[PDB]
Amino acid sequence: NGYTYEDYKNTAEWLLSHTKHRPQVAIICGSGLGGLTDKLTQAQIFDYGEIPNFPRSTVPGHAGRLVFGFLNGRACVMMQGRFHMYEGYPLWKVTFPVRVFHLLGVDTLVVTNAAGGLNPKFEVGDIMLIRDHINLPGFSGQNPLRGPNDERFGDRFPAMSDAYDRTMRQRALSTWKQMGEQRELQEGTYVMVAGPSFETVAECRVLQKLGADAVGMSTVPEVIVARHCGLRVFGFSLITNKVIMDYESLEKANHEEVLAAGKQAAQKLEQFVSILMASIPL
Amino acid sequence: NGYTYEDYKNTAEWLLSHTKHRPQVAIICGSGLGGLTDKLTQAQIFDYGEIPNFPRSTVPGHAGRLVFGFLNGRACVMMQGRFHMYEGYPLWKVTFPVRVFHLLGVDTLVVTNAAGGLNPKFEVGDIMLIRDHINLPGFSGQNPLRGPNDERFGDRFPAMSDAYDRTMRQRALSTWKQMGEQRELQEGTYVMVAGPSFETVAECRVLQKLGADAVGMSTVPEVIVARHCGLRVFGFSLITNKVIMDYESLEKANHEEVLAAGKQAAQKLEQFVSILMASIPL
Amino acid sequence: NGYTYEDYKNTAEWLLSHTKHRPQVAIICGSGLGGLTDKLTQAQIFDYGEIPNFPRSTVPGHAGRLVFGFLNGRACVMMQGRFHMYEGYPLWKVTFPVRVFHLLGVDTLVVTNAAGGLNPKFEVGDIMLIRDHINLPGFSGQNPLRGPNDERFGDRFPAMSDAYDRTMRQRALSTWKQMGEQRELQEGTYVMVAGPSFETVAECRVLQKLGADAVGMSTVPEVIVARHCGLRVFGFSLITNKVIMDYESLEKANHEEVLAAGKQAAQKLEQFVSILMASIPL
Ligand SMILES: COc1ccc(/C=C/P(=O)(O)O)c(Sc2c[nH]c3c(=O)[nH]cnc23)c1
Ligand SMILES: COc1ccc(/C=C/P(=O)(O)O)c(Sc2c[nH]c3c(=O)[nH]cnc23)c1
Ligand SMILES: COc1ccc(/C=C/P(=O)(O)O)c(Sc2c[nH]c3c(=O)[nH]cnc23)c1
Ligand SMILES: [Cl-]
Ligand SMILES: [Cl-]
Ligand SMILES: [Cl-]
Ligand SMILES: [Cl-]
Numbered sequence: 100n101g102y103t104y105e106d107y108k109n110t111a112e113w114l115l116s117h118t119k120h121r122p123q124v125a126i127i128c129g130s131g132l133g134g135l136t137d138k139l140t141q142a143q144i145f146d147y148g149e150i151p152n153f154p155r156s157t158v159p160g161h162a163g164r165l166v167f168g169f170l171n172g173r174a175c176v177m178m179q180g181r182f183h184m185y186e187g188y189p190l191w192k193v194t195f196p197v198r199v200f201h202l203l204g205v206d207t208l209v210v211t212n213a214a215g216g217l218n219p220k221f222e223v224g225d226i227m228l229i230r231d232h233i234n235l236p237g238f239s240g241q242n243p244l245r246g247p248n249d250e251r252f253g254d255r256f257p258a259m260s261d262a263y264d265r266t267m268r269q270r271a272l273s274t275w276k277q278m279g280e281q282r283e284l285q286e287g288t289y290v291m292v293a294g295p296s297f298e299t300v301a302e303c304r305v306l307q308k309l310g311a312d313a314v315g316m317s318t319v320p321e322v323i324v325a326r327h328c329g330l331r332v333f334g335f336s337l338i339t340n341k342v343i344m345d346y347e348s349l350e351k352a353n354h355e356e357v358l359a360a361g362k363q364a365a366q367k368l369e370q371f372v373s374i375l376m377a378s379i380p381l
Numbered sequence: 382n383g384y385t386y387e388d389y390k391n392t393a394e395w396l397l398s399h400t401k402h403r404p405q406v407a408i409i410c411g412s413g414l415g416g417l418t419d420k421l422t423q424a425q426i427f428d429y430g431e432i433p434n435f436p437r438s439t440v441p442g443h444a445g446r447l448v449f450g451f452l453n454g455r456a457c458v459m460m461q462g463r464f465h466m467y468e469g470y471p472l473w474k475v476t477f478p479v480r481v482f483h484l485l486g487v488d489t490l491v492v493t494n495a496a497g498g499l500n501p502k503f504e505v506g507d508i509m510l511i512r513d514h515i516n517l518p519g520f521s522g523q524n525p526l527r528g529p530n531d532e533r534f535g536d537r538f539p540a541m542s543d544a545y546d547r548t549m550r551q552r553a554l555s556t557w558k559q560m561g562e563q564r565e566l567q568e569g570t571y572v573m574v575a576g577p578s579f580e581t582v583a584e585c586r587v588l589q590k591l592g593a594d595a596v597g598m599s600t601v602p603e604v605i606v607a608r609h610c611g612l613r614v615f616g617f618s619l620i621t622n623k624v625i626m627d628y629e630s631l632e633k634a635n636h637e638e639v640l641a642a643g644k645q646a647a648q649k650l651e652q653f654v655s656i657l658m659a660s661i662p663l
Numbered sequence: 664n665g666y667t668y669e670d671y672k673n674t675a676e677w678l679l680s681h682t683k684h685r686p687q688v689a690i691i692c693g694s695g696l697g698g699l700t701d702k703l704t705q706a707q708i709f710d711y712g713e714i715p716n717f718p719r720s721t722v723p724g725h726a727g728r729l730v731f732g733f734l735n736g737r738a739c740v741m742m743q744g745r746f747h748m749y750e751g752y753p754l755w756k757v758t759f760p761v762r763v764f765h766l767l768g769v770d771t772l773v774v775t776n777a778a779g780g781l782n783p784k785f786e787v788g789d790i791m792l793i794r795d796h797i798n799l800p801g802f803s804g805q806n807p808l809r810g811p812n813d814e815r816f817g818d819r820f821p822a823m824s825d826a827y828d829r830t831m832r833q834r835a836l837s838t839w840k841q842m843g844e845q846r847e848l849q850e851g852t853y854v855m856v857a858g859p860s861f862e863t864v865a866e867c868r869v870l871q872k873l874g875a876d877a878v879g880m881s882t883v884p885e886v887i888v889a890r891h892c893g894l895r896v897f898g899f900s901l902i903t904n905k906v907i908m909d910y911e912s913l914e915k916a917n918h919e920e921v922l923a924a925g926k927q928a929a930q931k932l933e934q935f936v937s938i939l940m941a942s943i944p945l
C-alpha cells in the first residue's frame with residue numbers, strides 16, 4: 100500500500116476545501132447507473148484526475164468522475180467509474196475512495212454491480228439484494244486490509260458476518276411494493292471472482308455448489324473497508340445474464356449482453372435508488 | 382506485465398526472419414512428449430535463449446527449445462519445455478509463447494500435461510481429454526489477462542464456457558478406435574493448482590467435491606490466452622498417478638512415479654498426437 | 664524470495680556461535696502459549712532484532728523473541744511471536760525461521776494456533792489435533808516453496824498427504840487421559856485463510872462444505888517448509904470461538920474473545936506441551 104493516513108486526510112480536506120457539499124451517503128454506481136448523476140439536484144462534478152491521490156484509469160474509454168449533490172433530499176457523493184482487480188489495480192487503490200468518503204463523514208455506502216445468475220430462479224433484468232458475499236480472492240491473501248492496520252480507521256480483525264445491514268434490506272423490500280414492479284426483488288449471496296474472462300461450466304458448477312446466487316468482479320473489497328470504517332452498507336446486483344451451467348447449450352456469455360441489460364434497467368434502477376434515500380436513517 | 386505489443390511483434394518477425402516454416406498448429410509438449418520432436422520431418426530447432434524476449438528457465442536442468450517442422454503433413458511449432466507458476470514465473474511470462482504463436486498465424490493449439498487422477502474410474506497410464514478446466518488461481522486474481530487489454534489480441538472479457546473445441550474431441554475419440562488401444566480414451570475436467578507440493582487428503586477431497594477429474598499445475602493459463610486470441614484449443618492429460626484420497630493408505634505421491642508414467646506412455650502419446658494432425662482442419 | 668542459502672547458514676551459525684543450546688525440538692507458540700517460556704529451565708532469550716536476517720515485526724505491540732532451553736528434559740527452541748500473511752509478510756519471510764531451525768539440526772516441529780470451530784461438535788476451549796490441512800492460499804500460488812528449489816533443503820515436489828505424524832497424534836491422545844481432562848481431545852482438518860477480517864456466513868458454509876473442522880490464519884506455510892526439510896510435524900488448535908453459521912444469530916466474532924479463550928486455556932496448553940516432550944522420540 101503506497102498511501103499514508105496523511106495522504107487520505109489531504110484528499111478529504113482538498114474536497115472539503117473545493118465544495119460546500121457535506122455528504123452522508125456514498126453511492127458507487129455499477130452497470131446502468133451511469134445517468135443517476137442526471138437526478139442529483141445542485142450537482143458539483145470532479146474528474147478523478149483533479150482529485151488528489153485519486154487513482155485514475157489508464158484506459159482511454161472511461162474518465163471516472165466524482166459528483167456531490169442531493170438525491171431525494173439526501174446529501175450524496177456518487178462514484179461514476181469504478182476500479183477492478185482485472186484492470187490491474189491493487190486493492191489498496193480499488194478501495195482508496197471509501198476511506199476518503201469516511202473522512203468526509205459519510206456514514207452510509209450504497210454499492211451496485213452487474214452479476215451473472217447462478218441461482219436458476221433468477222432471470223435477466225432481475226435485482227438481487229446482497230445479503231452476504233463469498234470473498235474468494237480474500238481467502239488467498241487478496242484482502243484490502245492486508246498490511247499494517249491503522250486504529251484511526253478501525254480494528255485489526257473486523258467481523259463481516261453482519262456486513263449487509265438487515266434494516267436497509269427490509270426497508271428495500273417495502274420500497275419495491277411501492278414501486279409496484281411486476282417482478283419480486285430477489286435476495287442472495289454474491290461471490291466475487293477477479294476475472295476478466297467469463298466462467299467455464301465446471302467453474303459455474305463450483306460457484307453454485309459453494310452456495311453463491313450471483314457472480315461479479317467488484318464490490319466486495321469496498322464493502323470490507325466500508326465495514327472496517329464503521330459504515331452502514333447496502334448493495335444489490337443487476338442480473339445481466341444466466342451463467343451457462345451445461346455443455347449442451349451453444350451460448351457464450353458476452354460483455355455486449357451486460358451493457359444491454361444495463362441500458363435496459365437504467366430507469367428502474369435510478370428510481371429504486373432515489374426512493375431508497377428516504378429510508379436512509381439521518 | 383513487462384511486454385509491449387512491439388515486443389511480441391519483434392519476436393514473431395525475428396522467427397519469421399530466421400525460418401521458412403509457416404506453422405498452422407502449435408503443440409506444447411507436457412510429460413512424456415519429450416521425443417515427439419524426433420517425429421518432425423524437416424526439423425529446425427531454436428533454443429529459447431536465442432529467441433528474443435523469450436523467457437529462459439534459470440534452472441540448470443532444462444534448456445527449453447522451440448522446434449519448427451511437419452508432423453503427419455501438418456506445419457507445427459512444438460514447445461519442448463514449459464513455464465510453471467511453481468517455478469516463480471508470472472503468467473505474462475508463462476503464456477508469452479502463445480501470443481507469439483498467434484502472430485506467426487498458428488490457428489490451433491494442442492496442450493498436453495501430467496495430472497493426478499481424482500476420478501476413481503481413472504488408472505495410471507490413462508489419457509483424459511480436457512473437456513473443461515477449473516482455474517482456481519484465476520478466481521483469486523492470477524489470470525493471464527489481468528491488466529490492460531490489447532484489442533489486437535482479443536476482447537477485454539472473453540468467454541471460456543466453449544474453450545475446448547467439441548469437434549476436435551469427437552475426432553479424437555474416433556482416432557482412438559483406429560489406434561485400437563486396450564483402454565478407452567477418458568474425458569473430464571482438469572483443475573489447475575499452483576503447487577509445487579502435492580495435495581493433502583482433505584485437499585484431494587476438496588478438488589473431487591468441486592467436480593474435478595484430474596489435477597495438474599499447468600495448461601490453463603495457456604488455454605485462456607489461446608482462446609483470447611481466437612485459437613482452436615484441444616488438450617489431454619496423462620494420468621501419472623491416483624491422488625491419495627484416504628488416511629489409511631501408507632503411500633505418498635512422488636515426481637519419480639510421474640517421470641516413470643511419462644517414459645512408459647511416450648510411444649502411445651507420440652502416435653496419438655501425429656495421427657491427430659490429420660483431423661486438424663486446414 | 665530475498666534470502667540465499669548463505670543467508671540461512673549465516674543465521675544458523677550466528678545462533679550456534681551465541682548459545683551452547685543444541686535443540687532437537689522447535690515449538691511455534693500460538694494463542695495462549697505466551698508464558699510457556701516461563702517453564703523452560705536454563706532459558707537463553709534472543710530478540711528477533713539481534714538475530715541476523717530474522718524478520719522483525721514493524722508493529723510496535725509485539726517484540727518477537729526466540730528462546731533456547733530445556734522443557735521436560737527436551738532441548739527446545741521456542742518462537743514467541745509469529746509472522747502472518749495478514750501482517751503483509753511474504754511467505755519466504757513467514758517460514759524463514761523453520762529453515763534456520765533445520766540448520767540448527769532440530770528434527771521436530773510443534774505448531775500451536777487459535778482457530779474458529781466449523782465442526783458443530785466443537786466447543787470454545789477445546790483442543791483439536793491437526794490431522795490434515797486445506798491450504799487455500801497455496802492453490803492460488805501462495806505456497807512458500809514457489810520459486811527455485813534448493814536440493815540442500817529438499818525435493819522440488821514434496822508430498823504432504825502424510826504431513827502430520829500419525830505416531831505423535833496417538834501418543835498425544837494417550838497423554839490426554841494421563842492429564843485426566845474433563846473434555847475429549849479433538850482431531851480434525853485446519854483450513855488456512857489469509858484474513859485478517861473474520862468470515863461471512865456464506866464463507867463459513869463454504870469452509871464447512873469443503874470438509875474443514877477449524878479455520879485459522881497461520882501454521883500451514885510453516886508445516887509445508889518443515890515437511891520439505893524432513894522435519895516430523897505435530898500441531899493442534901485452541902478452539903477460540905464457534906464460527907457464526909446462520910443469519911438469525913445477532914453475534915459477531917471478535918479478537919477480544921480470542922485473547923480471552925487464550926488466557927483461559929494457557930495453563931492447560933502449557934501442561935499438555937511439556938508432558939508431550941517425553942513422547943518425542945530422541
Ligand atoms: C465480464 O464482463 C463484465 C464486466 C464488468 C462487470 C462488472 C462491473 P461492476 O458493475 O461490478 O462495476 C461484470 S459482472 C458480471 C456480469 N455477468 C457475469 C458473469 O457471468 N460472470 C462474472 N461476472 C459477471 C462482467
Ligand atoms: C508435483 O510434480 C509434478 C511436476 C510436474 C507436473 C506437470 C507438468 P506439465 O506436464 O503440466 O507440464 C505435475 S502434474 C501432476 C501429476 N500428478 C499430480 C498430482 O497428484 N497433483 C498435482 N499435480 C500433479 C506434477
Ligand atoms: C481474526 O483474529 C485472529 C487473530 C489471530 C489468529 C491466529 C493467530 P495464531 O494463533 O495462528 O498464531 C486468529 S485464528 C482464528 C480464531 N478464530 C477464527 C475465526 O473465526 N476465523 C478465522 N480465524 C480465526 C484470529
Ligand atoms: Cl498517477
Ligand atoms: Cl496488483
Ligand atoms: Cl496486487
Ligand atoms: Cl532474461
Ligand SMILES: [Cl-]
Pocket residue numbers: 469470471472
Ligand atoms: Cl510472480
Ligand SMILES: [Cl-]
Pocket residue numbers: 470471472
Ligand atoms: Cl505474479
Ligand SMILES: [Cl-]
Pocket residue numbers: 719
Ligand atoms: Cl529489516
Ligand SMILES: [Cl-]
Pocket residue numbers: 751752753754
Ligand atoms: Cl507479499
Ligand SMILES: [Cl-]
Pocket residue numbers: 752753754
Ligand atoms: Cl507476496
